[PDB]
Amino acid sequence: SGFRKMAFPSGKVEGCMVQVTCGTTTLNGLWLDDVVYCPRHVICTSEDMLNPNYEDLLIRKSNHNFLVQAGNVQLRVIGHSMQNCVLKLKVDTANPKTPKYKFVRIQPGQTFSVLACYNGSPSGVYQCAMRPNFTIKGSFLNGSCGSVGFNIDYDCVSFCYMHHMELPTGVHAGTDLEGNFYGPFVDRQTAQAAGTDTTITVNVLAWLYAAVINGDRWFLNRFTTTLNDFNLVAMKYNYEPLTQDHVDILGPLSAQTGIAVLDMCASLKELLQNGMNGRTILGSALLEDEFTPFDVVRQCSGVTFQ
């Protein structure tokens, strides 16, 4: 037992991280087969980055303007192209460490692991969620752009995120691996800002089930509620609506604990109206919304990856 914010083993991804330099800008790239993926703002300078035309900027570059270093071994760039907000740098060597992989785009409310990197060297790993407003609450310093987020499903790495920027509030924004931003953010200096977030309701319920599975039960009650009457309270407290699909997805956790989904909603209702009154759940004094029903089943049942 126990319940922790768990990331996927990062090794398969560590073997893909490289350093990409163009002019005075150094950042991280992802090396799969014979292509290195990196944020296209690598080709911009400080004054470029104000209001740039990336097609103009890129036609002025050459293969030899991109230094790629894979460890202490230089990769030779033999072609380059832009796809949306990422650069694709064709190199003369296929990455011998290429895992089986897919490029997938996730939904707000879904989680993923982040391998933070600087100068192509992995620094740390942690677990994030895509917020309903398409930001993530990460940990990123200057030079971390190009770090990726991913999930692992048996032996296959599903890359979902490439880091691009930090917004004024300290939250982070980036793209999927086809270079399409998550949310209404651009790789130009504007006054862009996050926008109002909500709490991921289905995830809080999943975590409440994790808590029961791990022996925290003080928040349970004999009450129940209808889906509609719960949603009227959820809206009040800036929680997103709960759908029948969410109820179905919470099915297995319901059956394992014997607490009907709508009963746990009644428990959440009372937590929202009363607060926690000195007590904690799974070592938290807040309702945690960055674990999916999948994450809870995985951690509380023990699936591995190979």
Add this chain to the structure above:
Amino acid sequence: SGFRKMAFPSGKVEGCMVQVTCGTTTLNGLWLDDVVYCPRHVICTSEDMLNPNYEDLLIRKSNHNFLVQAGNVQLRVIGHSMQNCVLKLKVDTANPKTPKYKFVRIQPGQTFSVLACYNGSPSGVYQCAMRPNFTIKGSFLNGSCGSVGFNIDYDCVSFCYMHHMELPTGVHAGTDLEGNFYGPFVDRQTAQAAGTDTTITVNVLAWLYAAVINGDRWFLNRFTTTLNDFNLVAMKYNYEPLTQDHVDILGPLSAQTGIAVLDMCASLKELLQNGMNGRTILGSALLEDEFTPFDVVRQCSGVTFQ
């Protein structure tokens, strides 16, 4: 910016994990050079595990009683011996993926990453602290014994922990890699139990500095306090004492923020006496004590590992 519970990249350790089977018991082992390290209770059965004599049990075993699987490749055991509570299984192949490494024993209050494993396959990675009572609050299911905890310093893996058991309260206990338990726990079925824990004071202060570095300042005040008068309050709330050495170690974080160490103690004093009153710090409504001063400098400054 941002601040997350960050683990070290786990790849160097993933390449050392193997499966060890003896009789009907399967668990994880650590394969470095030509030795596989695993918990010695692998040789026990259910009724053995009540009150066992491990020297007796081990002299009755043979090399061929230990099946070691490194992925889908069987390793041949050519020798075995016991060191304290671990087994050392000499195999006929040196692990080609052996990193530079050290076996180190950590102090309560220090942190480390855990690579949870089942059947020799890595499952997830997360960050723990050694509690003052020599337990850790982990996430471990049946079959995870033999998973290890570690830190990385440039390119060298310092292994500090091998998982052995879960105590009745849901917390976890194990050994260093020489097989000496952390704390007063034994690998026999007794009624052993955790014992009273305290909060790691120097770590809370480190995390308060992390918060200031990341823009949370509402808890700051103009007050100050003496070391002795702070410690009188710390004891009341079950915090461990703060020493001049802790003050010296908080030096760099003090200088970076311009908040004298003793001033931040005055801030903590008031948080302890008043609570947080609806507010949060770094996304927590509790005072977090599982980040060291080292961890904060690392994350808020950006060191990598290669």
